[model samples]
Target chain A: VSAEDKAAAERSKMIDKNLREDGEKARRTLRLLLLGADNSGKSTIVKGIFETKFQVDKVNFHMFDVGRRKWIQCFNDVTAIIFVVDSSDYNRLQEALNDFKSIWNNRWLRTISVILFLNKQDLLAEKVLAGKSKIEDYFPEFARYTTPDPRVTRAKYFIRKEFVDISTASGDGRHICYPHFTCVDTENARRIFNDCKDIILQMNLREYNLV
Target chain B: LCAIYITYAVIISVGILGNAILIKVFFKTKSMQTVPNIFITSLAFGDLLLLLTCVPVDATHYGWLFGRIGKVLSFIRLTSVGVSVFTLTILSADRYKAVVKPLERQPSNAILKTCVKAGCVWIVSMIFALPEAIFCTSYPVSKKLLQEIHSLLCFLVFYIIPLSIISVYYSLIARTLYKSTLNIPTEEQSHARKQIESRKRIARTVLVLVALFALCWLPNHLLYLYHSFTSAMHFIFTIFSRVLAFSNSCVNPFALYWLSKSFQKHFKAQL
Candidate 1:
């Protein structure tokens, strides 16, 4: 047997075996998969987790760190997926949407709930209200989509809808998705993640019929 | 007067040699033919002309050897100043576009287009300097009146406006560069990260050049304006400011040598 293949097989066994041992509290521990393209603030969100022990009140989360386009390599029994999007980047809306759709359609992630973080809300709101780069310029469909909120700009909602539509198309009633408008560097990040933590716990209980 | 002459002699020697070497490197090295370096080459040529023509006469105790010659030298000096600032402005804009919007397509004839734009900068500089050249010796009003008018106009046009535009452009570029590093780099995206670092280095190098230009010329402009209006001309400060301003002609080659490996290599190779 080749050493390369042998080492690869060894890695495969060791991860699954180690995870099995770590399954001591696998019921309580949430294994999160962070998915996004480059500069979508996924890395910024991940930077907040030092020692990789992203802990909340009861659940200690372990996030799988992967490169921007290396999402397929990290789909190992993930409890929940956090997909980030640069809301200000109107030019790459289609690129972000297509990647999200690919993740949603994967067999390993069919039942996993995705927590969508609409990142860089600050840049988005600033750009939108500035009257400089109108959303209708890049995404023409934005003109037709009337925002129900009278106070905020339509661009934010349009971006959220673009990603949410992918999840809606791929999922049945069993799977659930959550979204939050987040600027991860702000004080509200922990607050927002706390809210997401509760949603993940509730879904975990629902899977076991413990609730 | 003896000290002033000594300072000018040293300034003239250094300025002439440094700018000469810079121009030689630009032509000798094929890789230095990039768009931004074209602007740098234009700036070096302008500095060379200003040093050779103006500094020698300005250093002398006697004002002018002939009529209109000093005025014509005045024209050349201002034209060089215009070229230096306009080229710096163009360089800032080019770096801004390259960093902030990296995906924009360059025209196939980019080098030719850059040359044309640089040529236009020279034409515009000459036109702006024409008024100062004409009025340096002869004006409709009293001599004092013409001095203040010319001083104010040059300060406004040459010093204030171009620097303001360059400042704003670089401010935007700096913000974009800072925001770029707030992300995590993975093995797959190492190539992009390296590219960003290269661009950031180049931006910093050019920013240093801008800073040096602004710093060197500011005191001269302020002092000239002050002398024109209130006429509290401190002899020592006046000579010092003039030395500082003219000394800027030699500073770019050293700045590039310190900040850039390419220039350092070529500069060493030529030596």
Candidate 2:
């Protein structure tokens, strides 16, 4: 390899080692953002995770409440973006999907692996199949059907594909469902963190051009 | 006291006329019967019921109006108030879902959902108000006993329970918006980000509405509760509660108009 290439590889290796050391030593400084529409249980999810990781008296983590702000500073430092969705809330689904699309379109968000928690999943089997068909059925123009233009069709298809694919691609390849992190169950919390870890590692690898 | 009655009369007239207009518009214009509109229609219907049955009786009690029709109006007043409160709670919840859960993309076919939900609200309100309606007859009571029972029932059924639920819902909404802000990436397009920001603002406004509702009604409810425990306090409490209650009715339409863009536009168009 050329000297420059060698130097680049060494720098990448050094950064990886530092990150690994930080992860193993102190808690990894993973700044995560929780997002959903109003009443979608985004804060509940964040509080659940925070409670699991730190006790009430613990000062290890800092939570800055961003009320209506567009973007939380240091969002890129986040290990994962937990997107909560009220699966039972069918009326506002279109708007929520549009918002999620906007988030995905963010160039800075490219490295983040999203955990789409379809909350209120307990109501899913009944509501989804019985009440309303899956999202694709609602937006047939965007989902099941195809456009005449190859490029436009491809773009639309890709967007839909990405949504389903990302949501379903959890640690075990199972779609993440509602009550994503059980407040009472530590094991479930660990499972969530583990999934987050895998995504974080993937992100880091990509960032370092090692993927 | 006279000021309070005047305000309520204004509200009663506006609520009656406004709700009637909404019902007319929704039925006349098929496009207005979509899911969200259905919810709005139910709200207007409830408001109309309150104006028709509750406000007139209340006006009579304050001596703003007088006669036999006034006494009969009082009997229906409690039931109307109960139903109105119930409808408002449901409307708030529906609005919350419409703004927040668009991903589920639930069907907005206005006719079906509106009829069902409105029917449910009416049924539930009637069921809940049955005890009050039956027991709360205006039979001449020793002024003391009358005050006691009224306070006990009104606070237990109307103020405390509904307010508690509204508070819980508002808090949950606030937390959700906070989390959403944290998750949105900065590199996202400004328009998309603005939409998210707008949603957060809407949710915050809903929270404000709940808070305002509580603030407007709590003093009157508390005074009633006090009067219930102590009959001697009835005279003072009666005047206070009546004033507060009337204020609540008048303020509600303004609240609806201010918080909701569609309602504001619709109201403006009528001018």
Candidate 3:
């Protein structure tokens, strides 16, 4: 609240919001790796791109399939991994997050960028808005556990969220890129692609310095 | 469990920091005492109160032990949220009057109207929040249907209705800006164009706040509706929704931090 801090605050207000995106060009051929906990719409995402004909097998909801042997090979040479989260499946956040941790720790994948799909928003919206998904349903951290602290971190309830900026996917040290989404409509897959493409374009352009 | 705790801790820490900074800057600066700023300050104040009162109780599940305190907090929670919604509507109305109908309005008129509306917000919120404050303790279980009706009533008045009202106001403001732009007059209109840009920013700020309110509170309220007709959810899912709903009280400070320029001026100064 001092004079200098006040002036600094004023200057910060004048800071350009679109600076990161200005003059930025997106990259093409973004090699994507889609991963998440079981029933998080990993297949649904694939289906989104190719529609019904894409034909991936049904998943076992109760199992931890991220570590499945067949999937390990996809970790390398990807531009970004679209981590599809079933925001409606509140039970599996920990499991999905754990999968993320393992993926992050994999020395082979340290440099890869990741963004979350926050899939199945429609399910979250259903009970309240009449066949719709509440955006909060897509992010289980809020309004889920109505417990008090001292005992807040008790073993049964920890989801360990460091931030909830929704505008940007990054927080603390865990960066996932974009921070906005509340998708319920399955028809809008292309919109997401375009959004990702814009950022990916910039990312690829910076690295390649051509095309 | 630790992750949930860590999440709440992080939310509280960041939320408090944001609200505190805003409250401080609003209080310290002379211009900050105006109508809109007062509303903003009230908003941060409400967020701070709900977080302080609700987060610990929520995390503990120990709230029911102190029934009276719980009722008061519950009452405050309902009122605070209602007040914030009313404030948003009034602020939007104030903005629309300022820009689109500038000649028909005056700063004094806005300040005076806000002063009246500010008091009315409390009166109306108290009217709605009083049931939980007073009747909650002694209410009968057989009253479940009636209670559900009450919950629905509050939900509509506070959430669904307010959002619709805010949306209409902003949409009209947007149309007014658009119509003005169309006449362009060949436009030596750099200042007016900049006016549009600033106007757009304000529109964006309110829009973001509305989106946050919708995103944060909708599930929680929907689940509340489900719960009232009958409540109790899958353990983790319940926790997530509760946290999300509570986070609404904590988001405005951050929203302003992300969106509002006048706020950032003094806010960054303190930082």
Candidate 4:
């Protein structure tokens, strides 16, 4: 009868409804991989998504560090990947690209969509522009894509480039770059996530039939 | 009469005040009021009610004090004891839920769930204690009946049942904590496993408080039970039982202050 009880009941109801809508599918687990520098708000971005989906305190999602040759082992089950880059570290852009490529060979990476978080974009306009240009140059093949390829290459390039324009300190470019990920931005993110979800569901349906 | 009255007044006053403060701190602070804290709060509330009712009446007389008021107090005391037992049981169950049912994640409605469960404890306790209120009479007991009934009630309800519950709950907690620790890998998970092991150690210490409760209260209950059926030993047993019960209250706050981080924090803040 207390206000606290009433609020809890309401929350439970809402959670129940959401869970029912996002009912459990077969072996199609939605595993998201979070990648970034030591402190480029990678954890924060994942935490943010977790908080939005579940309650803030309920974001006890696992965070595994993939140092050197441990990438394939660590990210073997990852369904989606978020590559968070510090835009301020303009010089290490190539190193970051190479590390990303080295790890990209995992079988899981083929099915995963990568979201590049260009963290700390508010440093300087020129710096942000240069960082974005550098990232595009690094993935030149991805920067140039057409409709026949389903914009996957362009999506990857822009996803990385967008990271170059976001500032974690001021939270400026976060709003702009939020739409790409399914979990990050609820409204737009939901649409993209659902598309991915449908594909996963269909694959699961096929697997179930085969079984 | 005077000695008993003073003992009751001092012990209950201290116990209730200390536990009330614990309940307030746990409820008021968001960080402190986790699932475990909720169980502790319920236990404190139960202990507080037990002392508040049972002590004040014992202060007033050897039997029921204000007729209807005495009956009510007696009922409250019994109910409080029941709630205390129930809360401890729930605490064990909650820990089990955390370890075994990890996927359920037991929605963080800790405070709310605890309050609801505490409410149920009170309701059940009241139902059980109703018989004591209806049956218990202060009408000048022929020294013989007083010795028998009081002793029997003290042994059966207070000592045997509660001690059994405490022992069972504490054992469950111990087993669960031990099982959880064994699963912690040393080499690969040194940091995380160490943190978990530390938490388990703290939990073990908290369980020790329940053991302390059993040891402290056992003497009083046994003495009362022994005196109930025998009239010759009434005088000595009354003195011993009363003293033991009074000491139970005093020991609780000290034990809690030593074992609980939140209590220690509050104690420090007060200083």
Candidate 5:
């Protein structure tokens, strides 16, 4: 073929490929990951959020009840993530921090909005209803931060403050994404999850380039 | 307190009995020479040395004023402890490779590696414990020499190195199980399922060993570090640490018994 004809033919092929991909809609479904310790209410958060009409292009959830490690290896690029935590587990608070950092370290996960749910407010009620202590008392790293980044040394390892925010990265500077919920209570789960859905969907759309 | 005597008696009897049975069967029986048993035999031998030197010579006598005999026993005891951790580390690593990279792991190679690893474990232990021979009254340790040997060797060799290495290997084992569940396709379902199951079990076994090692050693380590400042709590903590350490050896066989179905069955039926 002549150079002019070759260029024209290449343009035609590109157009055809684009048209085929549009027909295929290969990226229709979104990949979401639920991460937490065993009883961190990962299941409850997923259930409640979806129950209250979690809308993206199309919503699907996969549960790896056998082990959390399976889920980590399964999904390479997570569009949205729900990270649940027991706010009152003071003993495992350091453990949770490292876990939080692990998820953040993932190149794909860090870019998207992680809907961090700090569940078990009933115990946190015992944590503060009669005493003077905030959740930060347990997680001291999250305590002294007016800005987005907070750094703390755990196991003599310092957390990097760069590209870091717990659940407030896409905040309107009003409410952070973490909603304290007593997962067992109906109103408790519904109330926080409803608010979380709005924030996560909006942020993830922009972040994941779902638009 | 005679309670100390009672604790020592229970530990000596239980530890002696457990290790004796484990060691006897492991060497004599063909079936009990499985991968788990090979490692357990090395571990039981260590515990047996530990019981023979510490439980009888020190505990049954209720005390010892350091002489040639006590100092020599000290070297033997430290070496035995070292061998225990090293053997566990080797076993966990072997289990990890067996599960994670089964295609690469060979049974013939496993036996040879155990012999080599067990050899290394004992040699390294003896070298370190050799310095505790400073207490043998032959090589009178200077002020500078004594501090380094007593303070550094126990924590570094037995506790920290072994614990850290085993932790890394078990974490890898856990990671392998995670990978197995995700990568295995439907065609390889049953084979993958068994692999995953065994991975989880071995990971738990290794994890429990490390966790219990840390648990048993913590109070002892704490007492070693700050007993002078906390003199009020010293006696109680010292007793607690020793008892904890003793019961730790006793509990090993039990942990393996309950955790290992094959071992349990073999122990009950074959032996």
Candidate 6:
């Protein structure tokens, strides 16, 4: 390996050590793995909530922002995986789907939940109404995607269906996928995040058979 | 007479068990440790005491089992009643604070506020239950007239006034909830919808509790207000009213189990 690759290895080791230290302090705090393609607003959502370390329902959530391919080892102890998708990023939709498929189908994560955040919803609606970039042009499946739910536009529903279809294919009773349409910059983010917090808390309650 | 005895037994035993569960669930379940829950536990404890002291003696006709301490039991009985009504009222106000003006800031710690309010509820209730205690223990110049006055005072203070106060708070809550549902922007529809629906569910739960109190206790208060101690029909009516009122203590835990998901989950797990 070159000097740059050695430096990168050293950095990974440093972060690995830091995360291990956090795990030692509070074994009860949930380890949430945050994964998404670059610019999918993972960092924005984390920032909106103030920091990676936050508490909800009296349970501390320590979110790990895994920004690379080799960070898959961190999945061992994660309570849940939060996958952010830029619903308007029709150019890289398949890329997001493949990452989601690999992580979800991994044998180790069969029982873990995946909270799918379809981000940039306002931009998705704007693009769908503009008539400039038809979702059908990018994903021909949009033509056949008939949504009876009037809650959202056909474009928004099509994007969610792509990732959710992967989750649906390998359906495990233990693993649950929660799909939430979100815009991290808006005030509605608070409410949606609150729902996510409750979902996580309930998941823990289920783990202990307390619910 | 056999049926009446059986009914009292069922009400007292079931109420004791159910209210005990209410208190137990609050203590054992960590997620249920909230400010509103403090009020609920207070109400459940009051119900438990009311079932313990009020029903047994009331059913025994207050002369045979323990006639000497009847005055003390009566005082405890009215105090528990006062606690129940005031706690219910305060619970509604807490719900109102949560649902209506959620953005408004609390002046002190939420738990501390609940603690202070809880103390005030019992203090006010004891004061409300005081007159009856005085009449029970002492002989006024016009004892009959004095007892009737105290009974009417209870009818006004406990039943009419608190019910009206609760009604006004719930109406305001209902209006706010209704308007907020219509007011949500389309873009933020789903999240706000769920949040509002959860608020509405808890609101409806408390409303059901209030309705149970209103329905069960109405005849008892009316009978007290119209007391004459004169006819065989009047004697039967008193029994009827006492059974219904005692049954209210049992009804709340059942209603809560039916209405609340968390309580249902905890109750099932515990059982």
**lDDT to native, each model:** 0.68, 0.54, 0.56, 0.52, 0.56, 0.69
Indicate whether candidate 1 or candidate 2 has the larger lDDT: 1
In candidate 5, which residue pairs get closer than 3 Å at backbone N, Cα or C atoms, i.e. clash? none
Task: For candidate 6, write residues A125-193 as lDDT tens digits.
Answer: 777776778777878877878875243476777676666677767743355566777884553334334
Q: In model 4, what is the error at residue B10, expressed in angstroms?
A: 6.0
lDDT-better candidate, 1 vs 3? 1
Q: Clashing pairs in model 4?
A: A117-A163, A118-A163, A118-A164, A121-A166, A121-A167, B147-B228, B148-B228
Candidate 1 error regions (>4 Å): A1-211, B1-8, B135-146, B183-207, B231-233
lDDT string for model 4 (B1-271, tens) is 3575576567667777788777777666666545556666777877777776665654565534466654666677767777776675676566445433333443344467767886887798778776554344522356576557655764676567666765665566456546544432222232234435544664576567667767667776676455454456566556656556555555555655764444678666653
Off by over 4 Å in 6: A1-89, A96-143, A149-153, A160-211, B28-31, B62-69, B104-110, B136-141, B171-204, B228-230
Query: Which 10 successive residues of model 1 chain A have the least lDDT summed?
Result: A202-211
> Which scores greater on TM-score, model 1 or model 5?
1
Residue A199 error for model 5, in Å? 45
Quick one: best DockQ, which candidate? 6
Candidates 1 onward: DockQ, in order: 0.01, 0.02, 0.01, 0.03, 0.01, 0.05
* Tens-place lDDT digits, model 1, residues A1-211: 8999999999999998898667554545556777666888777775422225666554467776563334454465666677888887788977888888887887767777677788888888777777778778888887789875242446776677666666677555345555667774653335435534444433322221111
Better of 5 and 6 by lDDT: 6
Query: Tens digits of per-residue lDDT for model 1 on B1-271?
Result: 5777687778778878888888888899887666567777887898888777665556453335556554777778778888877887787677666556542324333688999999999999999888865553434346688788888888988788888887778777666655653331212232234434644664575566668778988998998788678624576787778778877767866766665665777888876
Residue B245 of model 4 has an lDDT of 59
Task: Sort all candidates by lDDT, best to worst.
Answer: 6, 1, 5, 3, 2, 4
The model with the greatest lDDT is: 6
Docking class of 1: incorrect
Writing each residue's lDDT as its tens digit, candidate 5 over B1-271 gives 6676676677778878877776765666675455445677887888888767765454334534555464777778878877876777776676655555442324532567767767887898889788666553223335545564566556666778777887787787666555544432112223224434544565566567668878987776666545322246556556767778766777777766665554566567534
Worst 10 residues of 3 chain B by lDDT: B183-192
Instruction: Look at candidate 6 and tell me the lDDT of residue B81.
Output: 86
- Candidate 6 accuracy as lDDT: 0.69
